[PDB]
Amino acid sequence: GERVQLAHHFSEPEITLIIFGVMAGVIGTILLISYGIRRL
Amino acid sequence: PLQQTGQLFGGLVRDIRRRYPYYLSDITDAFSPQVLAAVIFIYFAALSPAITFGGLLGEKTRNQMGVSELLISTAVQGILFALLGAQPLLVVGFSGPLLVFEEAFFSFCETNGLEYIVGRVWIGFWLILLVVLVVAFEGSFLVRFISRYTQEIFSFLISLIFIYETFSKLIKIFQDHPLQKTYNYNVLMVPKPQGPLPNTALLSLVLMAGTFFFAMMLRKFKNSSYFPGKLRRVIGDFGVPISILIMVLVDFFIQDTYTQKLSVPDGFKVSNSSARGWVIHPLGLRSEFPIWMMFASALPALLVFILIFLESQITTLIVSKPERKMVKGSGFHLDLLLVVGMGGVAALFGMPWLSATTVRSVTHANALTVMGKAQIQEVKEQRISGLLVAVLVGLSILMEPILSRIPLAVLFGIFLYMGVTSLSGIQLFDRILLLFKPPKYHPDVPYVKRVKTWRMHLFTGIQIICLAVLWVVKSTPASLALPFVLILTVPLRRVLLPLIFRNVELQCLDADDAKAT
Amino acid sequence: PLQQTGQLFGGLVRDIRRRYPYYLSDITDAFSPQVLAAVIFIYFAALSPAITFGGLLGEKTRNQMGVSELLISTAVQGILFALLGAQPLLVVGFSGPLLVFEEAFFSFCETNGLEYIVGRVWIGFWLILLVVLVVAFEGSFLVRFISRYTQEIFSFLISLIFIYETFSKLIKIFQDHPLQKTYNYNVLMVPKPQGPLPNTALLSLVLMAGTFFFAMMLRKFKNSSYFPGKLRRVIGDFGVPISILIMVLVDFFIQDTYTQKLSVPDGFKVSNSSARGWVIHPLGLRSEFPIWMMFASALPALLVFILIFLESQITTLIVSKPERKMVKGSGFHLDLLLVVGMGGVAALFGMPWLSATTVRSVTHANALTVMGKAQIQEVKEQRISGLLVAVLVGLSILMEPILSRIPLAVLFGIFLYMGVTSLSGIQLFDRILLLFKPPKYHPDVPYVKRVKTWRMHLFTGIQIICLAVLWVVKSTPASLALPFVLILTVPLRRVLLPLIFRNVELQCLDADDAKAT
Ligand SMILES: *[C@@H]1O[C@H](CO)[C@@H](O[C@@H]2O[C@H](CO)[C@@H](O)[C@H](O)[C@H]2NC(C)=O)[C@H](O)[C@H]1NC(C)=O
Ligand SMILES: *[C@@H]1O[C@H](CO)[C@@H](O[C@@H]2O[C@H](CO)[C@@H](O)[C@H](O)[C@H]2NC(C)=O)[C@H](O)[C@H]1NC(C)=O
Ligand SMILES: CC(C)CCC[C@@H](C)[C@H]1CC[C@H]2[C@@H]3CC=C4C[C@@H](O)CC[C@]4(C)[C@H]3CC[C@]12C
Ligand SMILES: CC(C)CCC[C@@H](C)[C@H]1CC[C@H]2[C@@H]3CC=C4C[C@@H](O)CC[C@]4(C)[C@H]3CC[C@]12C
């Protein structure tokens, strides 16, 4: 970044990949739940 | 296009198959000087509000986000929206409610001692979550309940706000340089003049008035019967560029009198190099970002999604009315998905999110319209114009000497022209003019020949109350509730209006395609 | 009306028998607000030229004739003409050619050491002899040889002169107060500013633009379809007074900026009391008047008679065309006699001779012109308007506090409105517009459908050559030969034109009643 930034365990690509993976998992869970409804 | 298929991502897939077959036509249809004239129009029409909003954002956020970030975000979003969106006539850019939300969120973060840009990153992260569910479940099908009533009320209110801000900038300029009997000839000018100057505000007013006059005269000359028809159409299409060039030359031939000019950042760099870089860490830059605020960002994310969704869908409805001869189709699910996703991604780069602005997209649709031998004949639907506008916005930093000699007064006259020409397609403004006309001079339309004059006046005055209420909300700190008050008009149309009006009267006054019931 | 009776003073009594029976109608027809609006219009439209020409005449003749003398002469001649003339719609006052003759005669008297005012008295004495003989022998029967050709050429030339001088006054205002980076805050204001002043020229331009814009807007609102018809037409008739009031209030609310105002004499006194009095002795004031100059004044008397005769008679032709719905009659013989006699009488009092000016008379006639539901319906032919204008011009000295708060820029916009509305009744102007139109857009008129396009364009181009030559004549020191050059078009129409144009083409293109041959 710029100036002095706090050091984190995960770098920016790593943390954004983790966040995108969590978001994709939540979206997939919601879609699968909706697929479960309206069938039984 | 507004039908609900019931399949996951059903609207997104159909919008792809509706427009992408016309991708070859979306490039070949731009081979005309009218497309270039529209490019020159929309370039300034999107750049000047972008520059103003970037300056205000830098002032109000301590330069965490400024002119350069907004310019880069606007260029990227315009390029990707023109290349991939199903409605290439839309213009995506910053809006007023977005600025109000950013001001409120910056104040909230300052009060709580939290990092503002990381909060924006997390809100944009939750923005991507919201849009995918809406697109998957076809949540963009609710806009079919937004009839001509709400669309025209929103368009009229937005045009009124546009004209009011255009006049307010001139009023502020006049206040900055009041007409005095004596002046101090030794006034510092960098970065802005620190005192009143002679002939400045008056020359700005003259430039604005001349710009508006020349633009209107050339627009009338397009419909006139002078000069050869091909040359007449060519001159009329370039009416705004010709007027802008004329007023720029007029100001350039005047050296002594100072006029405020367009200002852009020197290079492609962040506004505050000591605050943040091009990439902002979601975990915190200076301090560890709190865990609770990551989840608590959903409600501001919900507000931002509501704002963007309403603005973009209403703009797409307005630019794609059946009376405007849109014979290529529009995609509500694809455009919304692209806009919200680009905003969420650009939040990670420290850039503001955007929305399909009403005024700029309405002007872009109207600038591309070709009239018949009074009657709309066809519209030059193509993706080249928006792509070129976004490219020129991105390159506006590199062409500073061209922009550095352009006064804002010319842009003020252009904005007034856009505001007064954005009302052609609104029946609400037409009926407001009928409030000052005798009944025998009313046009032969279904809502006049089948509705009593006092009934039509009452129906028009009902909307005037709604317009006044919306204007009051804008003039209050809680101006972020404006979309909710706008949504409340739909229950008024579907519930309260039938209690006082008949079905035939409602069909005549509010027709989705301007038909005789 | 132009026929020769063959009886001594036959044309004089015939004009007396034509209009004087309608005398009771000439008073009753004026009881309407449109007449009052016309009075308000023509009051400024005749006072401002009177003030400007009086100032110029006093500057060029060392105040031997000045603003007060011109105002008094205007009042007296206007009252006598409105109470006795057979074309009361004519406006009597000073004109440019008369000023040029005054300058030339002052130079001639100064070179030869002659008394200028006594020479004027003798010339005015010779004027009474000339017009009595001409009316007795019906010399006004030669006016029938002036067709639409010469009438339209003279009207177009005079309108071009008026508009060019209106713009040249603005150019002079800009040059006197140029746009500068710095100004001297200590500049003497009495009697006029001695240096450039801030915000002066720009505010004058703003006032002129606003006045012309609002006058045009209210004229358009007269023919629009807004408001109830009675109120709409009342406002449209009072468009000029309302625009004047709005712009006067706008200038009044700006206090710091200096704007040039109307200046009237302090009281009813001669401009130079050290040179002459109210009555000038024809035998000489300071030195004995030479005998030879008493007889040598006949040639300048002939030149002045030609100028006044041609000006007033062509103005009477223009304001009393059959197409203008003047159904009460006009007197060529009586009005010429009255005008020249009043000029000769005013010469004895040291006051300038006057003639019917084209611009003011045509504006006065158009102010009382009633448009049908487009098509000219009727003209409020009445004597009260001219009499009231003369009375108000005479009383302009006593109303100094009101006239001292009116800027010249508002009057400049009024002059621009008069100039652009003076071109309506000219088919030459209409044919000029056809030079920039495709032939299919040309209107369905007899001179287009019966004559080939290039023949009509050549006919228009020949007239423009005459107009350009007359423009050259005006911009040359021999500007007193202008009526002779205008007369030279009468041989052009009746001799040279038939050699290159067919009889049908000449009948269609130059028609006294706009008929199809
Ligand atoms: C760039 O950001 C820095 C901080 O990130 C700003 O520095 C702060 O400025 C404010 C305003 O006076 C004050 O709180 C302090 O002077 C600074 N605080 C800290 C913690 O540094 C700086 O002003 C910003 N630059 C611009 C042009 O706004
Ligand atoms: C009024 O008239 C007198 C004389 O006609 C003017 O006095 C003359 O002024 C000019 C200008 O300098 C010079 O010829 C002499 O100073 C004067 N000559 C004579 C014969 O007196 C006087 O200037 C006029 N007043 C105004 C205001 O123009
Ligand atoms: C809609 C999108 C933004 C996902 C919703 C956010 C929630 C479910 C997820 C996304 C990323 C997650 C974070 C990822 C990594 C870490 C670091 C760890 O040491 C503590 C938990 C923490 C801080 C997580 C907290 C929960 C979190 C914020
Ligand atoms: C055409 C009009 C002006 C009349 C014609 C003018 C000639 C013919 C007449 C009119 C008045 C006359 C003058 C009247 C009085 C006198 C005084 C006398 O001691 C000498 C002759 C003299 C000076 C006359 C000369 C001739 C004269 C100038």
Swiss-Prot record, chain A:
Post-translational modification note: The major O-linked glycan are NeuAc-alpha-(2-3)-Gal-beta-(1-3)-[NeuAc-alpha-(2-6)]-GalNAcOH (about 78 %) and NeuAc-alpha-(2-3)-Gal-beta-(1-3)-GalNAcOH (17 %). Minor O-glycans (5 %) include NeuAc-alpha-(2-3)-Gal-beta-(1-3)-[NeuAc-alpha-(2-6)]-GalNAcOH NeuAc-alpha-(2-8)-NeuAc-alpha-(2-3)-Gal-beta-(1-3)-GalNAcOH. About 1% of all O-linked glycans carry blood group A, B and H determinants.
Record's subcellular location: Cell membrane
Consequence recorded when altering A7P: In ENEP/HAG antigen
Outcome when changing G21L: Diminishes dimerization
Superkingdom of source: Eukaryota
Effect in UniProt of substituting P13C: Diminishes dimerization
Keyword terms: Blood group antigen, Cell membrane, Glycoprotein, Host cell receptor for virus entry, Host-virus interaction, Membrane, Phosphoprotein, Receptor, Sialic acid, Signal, Transmembrane, Transmembrane helix
Outcome of substituting G1R: In ERIK antigen
One GO molecular-function entry: identical protein binding
Keyword Signal: yes
A GO cellular component annotation in the UniProt record: cytosol
Chief localisation class: membrane
Documented effect of changing Q5K: In ENAV/MARS antigen
Segments crossing the lipid bilayer: 15-37
Role summary: Component of the ankyrin-1 complex, a multiprotein complex involved in the stability and shape of the erythrocyte membrane. Glycophorin A is the major intrinsic membrane protein of the erythrocyte. The N-terminal glycosylated segment, which lies outside the erythrocyte membrane, has MN blood group receptors. Appears to be important for the function of SLC4A1 and is required for high activity of SLC4A1. May be involved in translocation of SLC4A1 to the plasma membrane. (Microbial infection) Appears to be a receptor for Hepatitis A virus (HAV).
Assigned protein family: Belongs to the glycophorin A family.
UniProt miscellaneous comment: Involved in several unequal homologous recombinations or gene conversion events, predominantly with GYPB and more rarely with GYPE. The resulting fusion proteins are observed in different phenotypes and encode low incidence bloodgroup antigens.
Quaternary structure (record): Homodimer. Component of the ankyrin-1 complex in the erythrocyte, composed of ANK1, RHCE, RHAG, SLC4A1, EPB42, GYPA, GYPB and AQP1. Interacts with SLC4A1; a GYPA monomer is bound at each end of the SLC4A1 dimer forming a heterotetramer. (Microbial infection) Interacts with Streptococcus gordonii hsa protein.
UniProt-recorded name of the protein: Glycophorin-A
Record organism: Homo sapiens
Residues included from the entire protein: 78 to 117 of 150
Curated annotation (Swiss-Prot), chains B, C:
Regulation: Phenyl isothiocyanate inhibits anion transport in vitro.
Entry keyword Transmembrane helix: yes
Positions of S-palmitoyl cysteine lipidation: C466
Localization (cell): Cell membrane; Basolateral cell membrane
Topological type in the membrane: Multi-pass membrane protein
Residues carrying sugar: N272
Mutation effect (P178L): In RB(A) antigen
Mutation effect (P196A): In KREP antigen
Result of changing R493W: In SPH4; Prague III
Residues the UniProt record annotates as site (Important for anion-proton cotransport): E311
Effect noted on mutating R219C: In DRTA1; reduced red cell sulfate transport and altered glycosylation of the red cell band 3 N-glycan chain
Effect of P191A: In NFLD+ antigen
Mutagenesis or variant effect for P491L: In acanthocytosis; slightly increases transporter activity; impairs expression at the cell membrane
Cytoplasmic compartment spans: 87-89, 137-148, 222-232, 315-330, 368-383, 424-461
Effect after changing R148C: In SPH4; Dresden
GO-annotated molecular function: ankyrin binding; bicarbonate transmembrane transporter activity; chloride transmembrane transporter activity; chloride:bicarbonate antiporter activity; hemoglobin binding; monoatomic anion transmembrane transporter activity; protein homodimerization activity; protein-membrane adaptor activity
Outcome of mutating L317P: In CHC; Blackburn; induces abnormal cations sodium and potassium fluxes; decreases anion chloride transport
Renumbered residue ranges of the record's region (Microbial infection) 5ABC region: 350-384
Pathology noted in the entry: Ovalocytosis, Southeast Asian: An autosomal dominant hematologic disorder characterized by ovalocytic erythrocytes that are rigid and exhibit reduced expression of many erythrocyte antigens. Clinical manifestations include mild hemolysis, intermittent jaundice and gallstones. However, the disorder is most often asymptomatic.
Function: Functions both as a transporter that mediates electroneutral anion exchange across the cell membrane and as a structural protein. Component of the ankyrin-1 complex of the erythrocyte membrane; required for normal flexibility and stability of the erythrocyte membrane and for normal erythrocyte shape via the interactions of its cytoplasmic domain with cytoskeletal proteins, glycolytic enzymes, and hemoglobin. Functions as a transporter that mediates the 1:1 exchange of inorganic anions across the erythrocyte membrane.
Protein name, as recorded: Band 3 anion transport protein
Organism field: Homo sapiens
Gene: SLC4A1
Full protein segment contained here: 371 to 894 of 911
